[PDB]
Design a protein around this nucleic acid. Structure first.
Lengths: 141, 53, 167, 82, 206, 63, 143, 100, 145
RNA sequence: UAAUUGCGAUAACGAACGAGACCUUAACCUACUAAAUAGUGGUGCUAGCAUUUGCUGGUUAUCCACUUCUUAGAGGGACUAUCGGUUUCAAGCCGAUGGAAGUUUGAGGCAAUAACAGGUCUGUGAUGCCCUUAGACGUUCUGGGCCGCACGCGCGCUACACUGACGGAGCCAGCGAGUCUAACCUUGGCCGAGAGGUCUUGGUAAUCUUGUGAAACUCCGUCGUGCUGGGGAUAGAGCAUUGUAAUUAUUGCUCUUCAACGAGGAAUUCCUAGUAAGCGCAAGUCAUCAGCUUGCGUUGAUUACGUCCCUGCCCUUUGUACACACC
């Protein structure tokens, strides 16, 4: 009966399922801490929500994220969305509603795309074209 | 007479043909129907294939 | 022995084969349609038509040799194919039956306009909402032409779809 | 039979790769206390060997005069000590 | 808050930023305000983004595509020139390197340097052609600030790429030198030369 | 172009004129009353019916 | 608490393990390397040909440590890449099967990589422990 | 015995109703079973030319065939299986029996 | 890292069978510029001579150059199964032999004249100038005369 | 208003078709069943860290209300909610404390009474008509041929070099594709730098390819203000395969030789979304591989509301001496 919440960050083709528990505040992605995300530029992007919420409130919550599908950017964005929504779910279950509202307000002020899913999935291919909506040529002579 | 088909007809488009017009071009071997494309267009509604998109 | 992916297409091809053979060899006798039923060690095929007795023939020799036809064609077990005949209800509501009747009338040789009037009055007496016939080709002319006769309104959408459009 | 181009002259870079003791200590004493130091700047000004400049920078940074703050690809941020 | 102990080393600079004040490793991304009416209500001020790789619903509305932050604008402006067009992963890297060099030089605020360069090398007016019939006619007016900054950045990058065309040397150096020349006033830049001949013909026409 | 078809226009007019007292201003209960008072073959069609119904009632209230 | 490559970095970890395996010298290198291209999609053997077999061994060991049942085909697919096949567009091409098989058999013989049930190669206990030791070494040297 | 009754149909509503009557008969007979597991419906796509010859703009059509596979894990004797198959019968529904 | 000393022995110009050799560039690219030897041959001879790539061409010895020409002219002597050679199973000898700078053109033109004198279709296409290995001169490939 | 879709309507009212309408791949069905093809909390066994909460992996029945990643169903949606600005304060166009977005929610399919002497008696066994039925224009075999070059034309591919050739290393896709007189799909070893097969506890198929390890990123080095290291195109030698046959290289590979290409002059092509394009996969013909075609994956700068100059279309005015009706 220990605390456990299961959330999911979604992208165009990337799904990252997040198990949120009450632990020591260590975040694991693909069985490893996200500090080795690799590009060293996306680490700051991942930390921006954690930076704005502060390490004080995320002291005793541990998240294990398993990602699959999509690309690097898709997976990392899905990871951020999953950790954000798992954080809000943890706040709904246990933490103060005022704290949840303040974190939601800060997140919306910074970037509305952090929690809300990026559901602008691409248009399909079309006949008589190489790309989505591009034609070859109306050759005359 | 064994001299009429000395050249092999075991494989290739000579044998991979449709059962309607016996043609060897515009054939589809997908799902093992081995039918010409236009005859498939004609009979797809009764076969089961339907136009959706 | 076959994956279901090829097996479904094979079953569709067999159904198309039976329908095409029956309509080609039974055009003179007024064929309308075929339905199938599969059960263990037996396959029943039922022909929906109008002249059930005439397609039966004398002592059912027609249906016996048609069963033997389908048998030797599709290489099933001997004697496991059985066909029956049923009189279609609402006979005039199928375009195939109307087309066969108009073919019969053309073979008889009455006027095209008289036949059009007759099929219109017959379809309205049957109760169909509307109809549309098109005669395309040469008819006492050096070059071809297309003439359409329509009764009621006929939609042109797939909202009614094959469910309501009969071609 | 045709060239279809002006085909003018090029810059004709004459970057010397061999250097003497005077050139070496001149560049070694001119690279410090300078606020404009990079691979392109050194190529433009001293016209010295890039590998020699790199090894000199590595030696100078392992002893410590100018520190690198970024270890990214194809570029390192060098800042002199005060 | 208490110091959590883990095998993973949390970097000292980001730890200090979290404890005291949010900023980069050394770059302080505060004091980003600008008093120009050409930039009021058009620049993201006091809402910084540590990374300029955002996936937001911008083009759906009317002008959010023009309301996205200036660093993202620079990223997209770099994102051009055929084969180079694309690759936002390295676009953010190259804009970060440009930020690093423009902080290493001009120890004042890099965004102050960039707005100085924009307002210094932004073409002040443009002429437009009209067909009419028989002969094309010219009519000269001024432009919008967004068009100004777009044309300035485009001309600067075009001059940099044409100076590095059929060349084997890096592009960050020439981009930085073009930006600094535009900021300070040098008369040797390609974009600056085009701008000064354009203003010559403009003042001739005025 | 967002304006709908005259057939659904007449459907809405007739529904309003025949069951005006039954329906109320609130849009949700407008949908959940139209679905049970009028037989419509499309959920989208009934949504458009109820949307134009509440729009016309808002116009009636202010206009 | 706890030492693993999951916790430690990779950029300096790969070089540290390459140096450690160079010092150990228990890889049993073939000898006929530096003449093969190592992949039909590869047209150029590495510049630092004096080594790089320790690097490839560390990479394959890390791969079979993250996963648990890999194959020579998987190794070829991972170590392959795009080929600039002239004017024709690029394509994906694998590595060299014989050198892949020889390195797999050498790993099996040395015992860093063992065989696994149902068919496949798996990380071995000694390899796991020495990986953890090198991870601790780099995590203690940098910190 | 661990029998698997597998439906390999295309009629979506027919598959739903036959699965429903099978599961309701199992429930009313009060015999252990597994839930009806639906394999993802597979779409067979044929991209073919609209026109026979090479006239007009390049236009194609994508014929689609939706096939639904589903199976229920039961444990019943042969007579009970035969009675279950005989009851709630519908033409076209393709049934098959496997034993694990 | 490691350092290197530059003495006065650095030579800008060199010779190789009365052919100019470019200096102030890498050794491997120097041999690529030299006729008859490419990038893979240069890399292989660098490995055989056992010299680090970081070292420049000036910091090379006459003994090193002699060893490099030795391996260039006799690769099979170094216990090689001879599958890295351009000229294998030659008709004139039947054994693998290394091609040299001018010897590449020599062997090519002897193959050409062999085809000419046997009057093969490949040889007649080579002499005429039209593509022999299946390419089409229909559409492109005419700005070459 | 990306539709005579609509408000209002001068004689109109009232209906019909096209349109509008009809829909998943484009979600969040957290009401409910869903992979010996799933999870973590602990469940049996394990290697390493302090015997400082446990950790990743395994064979599969070794578990305990479940569906948080993927399919459904009588029934869910967002109807441009609700407000502020402009309209004899009548359709609509815009900005805003929330759901997948509030430009019609994304792209497509089915589809206007009539016409083209537009393509197919020349890949269709729909077929009268002038052609054959003892060397037949049918069929069968070998070798040629849509595979030839002084020449022009458009689709498509590779480039003009710290972005890319690169190399040694990290981590990744959704629809689908795959064996009965056939033994097919390259899963781990042997003949073997690799290419054919020798064993199939992988396949009637989410598990063997395959959770598509490729397409874009991070430590390091050369082209370092180039008559060449971008350009394996521009030639020869060899190393390899179903096929009773591949020579005018079926295709891949290992070397050796850059005769072109410095935003490219007049004309034109395609594009507001997460679109053109930076780049690779699946299927078609297949004996071999596409660059062709039908479907996805990382992201895009400054209009989308604005007119005929050329690419044009339509309506109604207007003028006819036109009806196989400007040909």
């Amino acid at each position: 009966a220990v605390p456990s919440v299961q959330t999911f960050g979604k992208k165009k083709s990337a799904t990252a399922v997040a198990h949120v528990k009450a632990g020591k505040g260590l975040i694991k992605v693909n069985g490893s801490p996200i500090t080795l995300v690799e590009p060293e530029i996306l680490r700051f992007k991942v930390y921006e929500p954690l930076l704005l919420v502060g390490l004080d409130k995320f002291s005793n919550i541990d998240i294990r994220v398993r990602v699959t599908g999509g690309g690097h950017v898709s997976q990392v964005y899905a990871i951020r969305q999953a950790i954000a929504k798992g954080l809000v779910a943890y706040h709904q279950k246990y933490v103060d509603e005022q704290s949840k509202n303040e974190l939601k307000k800060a997140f919306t002020s910074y970037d509305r795309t952090l929690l809300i899913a990026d559901s602008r999935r691409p248009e399909p291919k079309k006949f008589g074209g190489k790309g989505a909506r591009s034609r070859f040529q109306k050759s005359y002579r | 007479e064994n001299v009429w088909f000395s050249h092999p007809r075991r494989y290739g488009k000579g044998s991979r043909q449709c059962r309607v017009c016996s043609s060897h071009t515009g054939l589809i071997r997908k799902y093992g129907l081995n039918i010409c494309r236009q005859c498939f267009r004609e009979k797809a509604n009764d076969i089961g294939f339907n136009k959706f998109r | 022995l076959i994956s279901k992916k090829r097996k479904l297409v094979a079953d569709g091809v067999f159904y198309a084969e039976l329908n095409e053979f029956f309509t080609r060899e039974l055009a003179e006798e007024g064929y309308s349609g075929v339905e199938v039923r599969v059960t263990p060690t037996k396959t029943e095929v039922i022909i929906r038509a109008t002249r059930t007795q005439d397609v039966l023939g004398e002592n059912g020799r027609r249906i016996n040799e048609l069963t033997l036809l389908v048998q030797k064609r599709f290489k099933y077990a001997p004697g496991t194919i059985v066909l029956y005949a049923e009189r279609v209800q609402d006979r005039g509501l199928s375009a195939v039956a109307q087309a066969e009747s108009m073919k019969f009338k053309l073979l008889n040789g009455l006027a095209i306009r008289r036949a059009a009037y007759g099929v219109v009055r017959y379809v309205m007496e049957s109760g169909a909402k509307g109809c549309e016939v098109v005669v395309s080709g040469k008819l006492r002319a050096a070059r071809a032409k297309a003439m359409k006769f329509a009764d009621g309104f006929l939609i042109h959408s797939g909202q009614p779809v094959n469910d309501f459009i009969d071609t | 039979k045709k060239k279809w181009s002006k085909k003018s002259m090029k810059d004709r870079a004459q970057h010397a790769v061999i250097l003497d003791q005077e050139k070496y200590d001149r560049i070694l004493k001119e690279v410090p206390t300078y606020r404009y130091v990079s691979v392109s700047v050194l190529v433009d000004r001293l016209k010295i060997g890039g590998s020699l400049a790199r090894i000199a920078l590595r030696h100078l940074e392992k002893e410590g005069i100018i520190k690198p703050i970024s270890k990214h690809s194809k570029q390192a941020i060098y800042t002199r000590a005060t | 808050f208490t110091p959590v102990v883990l095998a993973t080393p949390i970097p000292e600079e980001v730890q200090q930023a979290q404890t005291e004040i949010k900023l980069f490793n050394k770059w302080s991304f505060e004091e980003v305000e600008v008093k120009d009416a050409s930039l009021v209500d058009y620049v993201q001020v006091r809402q910084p983004i540590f990374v300029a790789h955002t996936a937001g619903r911008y083009a759906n509305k009317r002008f959010r595509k023009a309301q996205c932050p200036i660093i993202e604008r620079l990223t997209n402006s770099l994102m051009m020139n055929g084969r180079n067009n694309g690759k936002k992963l390295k676009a953010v890297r190259i804009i970060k390197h440009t930020l690093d060099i423009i902080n290493v030089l001009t120890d004042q605020n890099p965004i102050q340097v960039v707005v100085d360069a924009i307002t210094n090398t932004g073409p002040r007016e443009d002429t437009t052609r009209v067909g009419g019939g028989g002969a094309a006619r010219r009519q000269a007016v001024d432009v919008s600030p967004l068009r100004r900054v777009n044309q300035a950045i485009a001309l600067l990058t075009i001059g940099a790429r044409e100076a590095a065309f059929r060349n084997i040397k890096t592009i960050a150096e020439t981009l930085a030198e073009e930006l600094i020349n535009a900021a300070k006033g040098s008369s040797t830049s390609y974009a600056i030369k085009k701008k000064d001949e354009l203003e010559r013909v403009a003042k001739s026409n005025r | 172009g967002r304006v709908r078809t005259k057939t659904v226009k007449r459907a809405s007019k007739a529904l309003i004129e025949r069951y005006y007292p039954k329906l109320t201003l609130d849009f949700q209960t407008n949908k959940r009353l139209c679905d049970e008072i009028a037989t419509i073959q499309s959920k989208r069609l009934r949504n458009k019916i109820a949307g134009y119904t509440t729009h016309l009632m808002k116009r009636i209230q202010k206009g | 608490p706890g030492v693993s490559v999951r916790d430690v970095a990779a950029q300096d970890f790969i070089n540290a393990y390459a140096s450690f395996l160079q010092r150990q010298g228990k890889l049993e290198v073939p000898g006929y390397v530096d003449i093969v291209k190592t992949s039909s999609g590869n047209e150029m053997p590495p510049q630092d040909a004096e080594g790089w077999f320790y690097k490839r061994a560390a990479s394959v060991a890390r791969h079979i440590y993250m996963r648990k049942q890999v194959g020579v085909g998987k190794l070829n697919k991972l170590y392959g890449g795009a080929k600039s096949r002239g004017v024709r567009p690029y394509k994906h091409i694998d590595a060299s099967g014989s050198i892949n098989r020889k390195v797999l058999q050498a790993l099996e013989k040395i015992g860093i990589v063992e065989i696994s049930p149902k068919g496949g190669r798996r990380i071995s206990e000694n390899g796991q422990r020495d990986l953890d030791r090198i991870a601790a070494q780099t995590l203690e040297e940098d910190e | 015995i661990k029998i698997r009754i597998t439906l390999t149909s295309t009629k979506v509503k027919q598959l739903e109703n036959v699965s429903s009557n099978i599961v309701k008969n199992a429930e009313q007979h009060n015999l252990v079973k597994k839930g009806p597991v639906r394999l993802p419906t597979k779409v067979l796509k044929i991209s073919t030319r609209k026109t026979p010859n090479g006239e007009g703009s390049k236009t194609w059509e994508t014929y689609e065939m939706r096939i639904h596979k589903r199976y229920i894990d039961l444990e019943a004797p042969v007579q009970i299986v035969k009675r279950i198959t005989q009851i709630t019968i519908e033409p076209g529904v393709d049934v098959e029996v496997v034993v694990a | 890292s490691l350092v290197v000393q530059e003495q006065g022995s650095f030579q800008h110009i060199l010779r190789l069978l009365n052919t100019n050799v470019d200096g102030n560039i890498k050794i491997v690219y120097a041999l690529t510029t030299i006729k008859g030897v490419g990038r893979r041959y240069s890399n292989l001879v660098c490995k055989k001579a056992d010299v680090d790539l970081h070292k420049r061409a000036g910091e090379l010895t006459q003994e090193e150059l002699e060893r490099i020409v030795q391996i260039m002219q006799n690769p099979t002597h170094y216990k090689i199964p001879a599958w890295f050679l351009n000229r294998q199973n030659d008709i004139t000898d039947g054994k693998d032999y290394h091609t040299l700078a001018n010897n590449v053109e020599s062997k090519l033109r002897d193959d050409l004249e062999r085809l000419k004198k046997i009057r093969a279709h490949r040889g007649i296409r080579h002499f005429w100038g039209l593509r022999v290995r299946g390419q089409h001169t229909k559409t492109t490939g005419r700005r070459r005369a």
